[PDB]
Amino acid sequence: MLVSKCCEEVRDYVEERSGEDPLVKGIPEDKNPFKELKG
Amino acid sequence: LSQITNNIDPVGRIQMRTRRTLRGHLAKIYAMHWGTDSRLLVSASQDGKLIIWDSYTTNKVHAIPLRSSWVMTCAYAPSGNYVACGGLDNICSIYNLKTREGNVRVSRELAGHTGYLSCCRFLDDNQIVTSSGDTTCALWDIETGQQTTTFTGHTGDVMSLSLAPDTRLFVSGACDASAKLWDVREGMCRQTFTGHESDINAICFFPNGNAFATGSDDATCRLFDLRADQELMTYSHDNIICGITSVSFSKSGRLLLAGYDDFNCNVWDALKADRAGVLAGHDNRVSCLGVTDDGMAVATGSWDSFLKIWN
Amino acid sequence: RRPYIL
Amino acid sequence: GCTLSAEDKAAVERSKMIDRNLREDGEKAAREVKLLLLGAGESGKSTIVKQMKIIEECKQYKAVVYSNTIQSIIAIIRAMGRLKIDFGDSARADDARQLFVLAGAAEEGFMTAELAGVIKRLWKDSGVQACFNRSREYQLNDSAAYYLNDLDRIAQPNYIPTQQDVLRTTGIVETHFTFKDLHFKMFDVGGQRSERKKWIHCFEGVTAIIFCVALSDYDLVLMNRMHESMKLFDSICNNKWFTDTSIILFLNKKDLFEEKIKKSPLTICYPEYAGSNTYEEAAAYIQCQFEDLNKRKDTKEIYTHFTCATDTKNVQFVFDAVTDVIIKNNLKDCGLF
Amino acid sequence: NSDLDVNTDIYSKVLVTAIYLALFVVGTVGNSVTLFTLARQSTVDYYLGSLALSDLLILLLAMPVELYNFIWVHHPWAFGDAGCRGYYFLRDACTYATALNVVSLSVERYLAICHPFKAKTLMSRSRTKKFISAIWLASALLAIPMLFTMGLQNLSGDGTHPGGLVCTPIVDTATLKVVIQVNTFMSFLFPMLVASILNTVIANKLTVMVHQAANMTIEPGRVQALRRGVLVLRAVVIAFVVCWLPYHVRRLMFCYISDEQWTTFLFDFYHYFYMLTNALVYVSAAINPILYNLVSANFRQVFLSTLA
Missing domain, CATH: 3.40.50.300 (P-loop containing nucleotide triphosphate hydrolases)
Known part of the structure; x- marks a missing residue:
């Protein structure tokens, strides 16, 4: 059922969401909850 | 898909460090599900325990002693009130986190099955879908104890299951190499997907809820579309031949995390079908991995009894 | 006569 | 060391006591001997299990017993409406209502004197018994009669479930027998196919x-x-x-x-x-x-x-x-x- | 200005060089083939590889310099100041590596038999590689005192001859005595204790299991391996005592006698006994692969099949 349109939908969905994604953009390590803060 | 989606610039090399490490288990871990608050995660293993960790402080907020040690799956309800677990005992036992007593107890034992339970997912606090060992899937209602809608129609036994984000429907995979898109409300299958050589071991929805990837014993992840009713992409690479035990997407969908039996997890660019990164933490089969709904952390459990949390 | 050997 | 005002320390103490319970049960499992049973055609699988097994935990099942008991009586009462069976004494209608009120407001299986009274009176009623005897026409716990007949014992404030109570609450079958001062776990895996x-x-x-x-x-x-x-x-x-x-x-x-x-x-x-x-x-x-x-x-x-x-x-x-x-x-x- | 040279019989010197070369070739071949075999439960493999590695390093490092610089040229240091410091640093780091490896292997077997869960939790390949790296770092830290204590000194007739220079502890006798006696104390009396008692209680468990093996209905030709396990256990303990006792008795002898008791006869006896003690430590470092070889006659088959 028009697989090109559907994979283009997957593409535009992810490229819409790629920027605010905290793993492909990455972390600034100060907004990271997984800074360790231990000794 | 790679001929279309190659104009987008690549993600670059992904380097992630083990931001936490959740020790305590004495066997192979088989499952892990985040919470919808993205802080608690449950993780079950063959030593009779499932343990509700706090991912930030590495604290064990709970540890539930199970009646039969053989446990293939677990799920964490989106309220945070319930957990579930089932294995070779054919019983998807259900535990109540938020009790007045504060002691987790088996609210009900869901039974009436002639096979091991491959997977459980929570719809609501009163609806739970499972994936059995008699080649069928089901949907239980916990308050009655009766299975509401039994899903019959596979020939080889079913191996995974993945609810959609809006939980109106779900996808289950089996040894037929046929992923089927069931429907919760009506009660019949809608679409059947072939395209794998052998058995499929891992299914995860794309975050929009309009697609899903599928990890198999054929060293091939294959992302399918539900509307277009056919295979869309074949995430596979040469020099690797081992099986896949778990898959999960990122929050945006840009990177999919595949769990191989070369003892380490690989990170696939979901658009160019490139191995974008290697997560080389574990020293045995990576049996389960999962990404937070907030998209910040990725925890991965394995048969060396170590949950690592990468970021 | 001490040996330095060690 | 921050302690976040006394509760992170108590969380770490909770985690360490969980670690302690893990290591004790893990030692019990790591010293434990696991044995697999195989065979498709019946091949002494019975004979060997009968020859093997011939030579606080209960408290954990209390609310399961309660749950099963509540489920059983509700199943009967509900079936009465569907099968059009009247109560023996019209007064039981108020008790039926009260059953649903009490089960309806609670978090999980429980038992109080009030609830015990409501269920006892329902179970002794002749209409309820007539519906009970037609149980093949609906879905009812096998152990319905077992618990409902013993309600008085189960409803006592210091009730502790017996082994039979626990047994009353079709795959692999574990037999955890001991021999020559050493424990054995036998996994009858041939049940599930x-x-x-x-x-x-x-x-x-x-x-x-x-x-x-x-x-x-x-x-x-x-x-x-x-x-x-x-x-x-x-x-x-x-x-x-x-x-x-x-x-x-x-x-x-x-x-x-x-x-x-x-x-x-x-x-x-x-x-x-x-x-x-x-x-x-x-x-x-x-x-x-x-x-x-x-x-x-x-x-x-x-x-x-x-x-x-x-x-x-x-x-x-x-x-x-x-x-x-x-x-x-x-x-x-x-x-x- | 040539003195302190000890005039020994040349046939005894040739005869201990031949022993040294035999232990050299045997230890190098055995340790090379064991590391290649272990390289081609995992924790006892890395433990045996670390002990064999430490023995190969003690041979290839210590053997040819000690050979050339005590047997042939008996007085001058061939290797300079950092040569002395590096020689005693390597040598004593390898001594602590061997002693702590045999400690860890004996605790691992005692753990592996009498506490199987506690040995499951204490053993992981991540933890074992971290632990062996830790024990090599600790052998280097405990060998730092053989850096700062030792050095060059000129003990010629006037202290200015370029050939009167020796390689000696440059510190006084009380500090020397305390450093060397705490080395011999912990590095030997603690491994003799753990090896003797642990391996004794393992041998008790194995002899009870042998007496319960004489289950003859279950038994194939596999009571040989239990007797061989008793023999290899006892070979480990006896070889460690007999090979690392005379070396530290020699160093004790150097430790206590303040030269008022030394004569010419004890001088000569000390030099010949030094030769014999380095013979025994190389017998240890070469007879590890032997008594791990000969007991595991299938792993032995693996050795000789890879060699052929």
Whole structure:
């Protein structure tokens, strides 16, 4: 059922969401909850 | 898909460090599900325990002693009130986190099955879908104890299951190499997907809820579309031949995390079908991995009894 | 006569 | 060290007490000896389990007992509306309502004097009993009568569930028997039927597989059943996970087999054999036909026994085999051998 | 200005060079083939590889310099100041590596048999590689005192001859005595204790299991490996005592006698005994692969099949 349109939908969905994604953009390590803060 | 989606610039090399490490288990871990608050995660293993960790402080907020040690799956309800677990005992036992007593107890034992339970997912606090060992899937209602809608129609036994984000429907995979898109409300299958050589071991929805990837014993992840009713992409690479035990997407969908039996997890660019990164933490089969709904952390459990949390 | 050997 | 005002320290103390409970139960499991049972055609799987098992936890089930009891009586009451059965005494209608009010407001199974009274009166009512006796027409817990008849005991404030209460609350069957001061777990895995290629890897780390064959199934047909048992034994012994784990082979129903070999020959089962129609030679030929199938012999070793519904010298041979496999695993784990 | 040279019989010197070369070739071949075999449960493999590695390093480092610089040229240091410091640093780091490896292997076997859960939790390949790296770092830290104590000194007739220079502890006798006696104290009396008692209780467990093996209905030809395990256990303990006792008795002898008791006869006896003690430590470092070889006659087959 028009697989090109559907994979283009997957593409535009992810490229819409790629920027605010905290793993492909990455972390600034100060907004990271997984800074360790231990000794 | 790679001929279309190659104009987008690549993600670059992904380097992630083990931001936490959740020790305590004495066997192979088989499952892990985040919470919808993205802080608690449950993780079950063959030593009779499932343990509700706090991912930030590495604290064990709970540890539930199970009646039969053989446990293939677990799920964490989106309220945070319930957990579930089932294995070779054919019983998807259900535990109540938020009790007045504060002691987790088996609210009900869901039974009436002639096979091991491959997977459980929570719809609501009163609806739970499972994936059995008699080649069928089901949907239980916990308050009655009766299975509401039994899903019959596979020939080889079913191996995974993945609810959609809006939980109106779900996808289950089996040894037929046929992923089927069931429907919760009506009660019949809608679409059947072939395209794998052998058995499929891992299914995860794309975050929009309009697609899903599928990890198999054929060293091939294959992302399918539900509307277009056919295979869309074949995430596979040469020099690797081992099986896949778990898959999960990122929050945006840009990177999919595949769990191989070369003892380490690989990170696939979901658009160019490139191995974008290697997560080389574990020293045995990576049996389960999962990404937070907030998209910040990725925890991965394995048969060396170590949950690592990468970021 | 001490040996330095060690 | 931040402690976040006394609660992070108590969270870490909770985590450490959970670690303590983990290490105690993990020691109990790591000292525990796990044994696999296999065999498709019935091959003494019963006989061996009856010969094996012949030689605070309850409190955890309290609210399950309550839950099951509440579910049972609700099932009956609801069915009365569907089957159009009236209460014996119209006054029970108020009690039926109260049942739903009390179950409706609670978090999980529970029992109070008030609830016990409501359920007791409902259960003694003649309409409720008439519906109960039509239970085949709806879905009702098998243990409904068991709990409802014992309600008075179960409703006592200091109620502690008995073993039978717990048993009253169809796959693998675990028997956790002990012998010669050492505990044994026996996994009757042949109850559930599915693809063995997708769950046998749960069973790596089993100390010893106890494979069972009936001798007398040499001539029956579905294709010989004995050839099916040899292919099943082949598929398990040469498996990629059980490379180190040895096999305790049993040969069951030997006296039947003696009768069946004194009447019928053995060439019909295996063509290329021309030995004697004697007991010891035919038993040696079947044993050598099974133990030739291991493609590896430097790693593991099959331990064969002849048994039936006699010979009580069984569990000592089981523990001799378990000791030899555990000693060879320990030697291998040491830098010796 | 040539003195302190000890005039020994040349046939005894040739005869201990031949022993040293035999232990050299045997230890190098054995340790090379064991590391290649272990390289081609995992924790006892890395433990045996670390002990064999430490023995190969003690041979290839210590053997040819000690050979050339005590047997042939008996007085001058061939290797300079950092040569002395590095020689005693390596040598004593390898001594602590060997002693702590045999400690860890004996605790691992005692753990592996008498506490199987506690040995499951204490053993992981991540933890074992971290632990062996830790023990090599600790052997280097405990060998730092053989850096700062030791050095060059000129003990010629006037202290100015370029050939009167020796390689010696440059510190006084009390500090020397305390450093060397705490080395011999912890590095030997603690491994003799753990090896003796642990391996004794393992041998008790194995002899009870042998008496319970004489389960003859279950038994194939596999009571040989239990007697061989008793023999290899006892070979480990006896070889460690007999090979690392005379070396530290020699160093004790150097430790206590303040030269008022030394004569010419004890001088000569000390030099010949030094030769014999380095013979025994190389016998240890070469007879590890032997008594791990000969007991595991299938792993032995693996050795000789890879060699052929």
